[PDB]
Each structure stands twice: as C-alpha cells, then as structure tokens.
Amino acid sequence: KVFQPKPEDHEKYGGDPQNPHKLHIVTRIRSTKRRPYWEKDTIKMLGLQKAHSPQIHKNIPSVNAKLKVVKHLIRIQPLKLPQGLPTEETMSSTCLKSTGELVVQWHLKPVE
C-alpha cells in the first residue's frame, strides 16, 4: 500500500501516473555503517559507494526491488531531458543540473 500512489501525491510531486519516467538519478545521502549486512551489499550492487555522486539506473521492477531495500539511505530524483537524449555530437557537452535535467549544451554564458 505504501507504494500505491494517491491523487494528491501526483499533484505534489508533479508526476503523471502515465508516461512514467525511464531513468532514476540515485544518490547516497547516508552511511551504510551500522546497517544490516544485506543493506550494505545492495548499495555496492547499485554502485552507490561515494555519497553525493549521481548514478543512472533503470526504472524497471528488478531495479526497483533493490532500490526499495535501501530506500532510507538514498534520494531518488527522476532524470529529465528537456532538450532530448544526447547524440554523438553533443555527448561531450552534457551537464547534469541539480534540478535533474541533463542538458546537451553547456556554454558557461549568461542565458539572456
């Protein structure tokens, strides 16, 4: 029941129950120390060794099951692509915002 969303929940987080996002941005916010051995393994299986380092993962049921076990130790933010997926040409100009948007052009200039 915890993972069954409510209509008010969608409004607060601004996520549609349909057209779900594909990729999770997962970061480790707390320590694995003092946690049961099984929780330690899941973190290393998911690659969340260094805290405050975002990792890209699939939003699929198998990944979700592991992500739920370490639900309390991480922050999940849906990846967003305002300008679309990066291409070969723009792969070297990518930059991830704190908002969760992977822009394909990084100029370091005023937006104007």
Binding site: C95, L96, K97, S98, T99, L108, K109
Partner: protein, 40 residues
C-alpha cells in the same frame, strides 16, 4: 551558507559545483593564447 537557496535557483548547492566560477579557465597567456586545460 545559503545552500538551499542555490538549489531553488537551479544552481549547485555547493558553489564549487557546476558553474562558470570553477569550470572556466583560471588564466590565459598575456598574448591571449589559451592555457592547457586544467587537469580537474
């Protein structure tokens, strides 16, 4: 100081994150020749 505000603006909570302050080159040559890219 003031880290939550930087997130609302869409910036990096730490000023030493993604931004012109860090990523831009620290120096150039007097002639204007660009310096070798910083290792970081």
């Amino acid at each position: 100081a003031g880290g939550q505000w930087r997130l609302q603006q869409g910036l990096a909570a730490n000023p030493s994150g993604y931004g012109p302050l860090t990523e831009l080159p620290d120096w150039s040559f007097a002639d204007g020749r660009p310096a070798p890219p910083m290792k970081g």
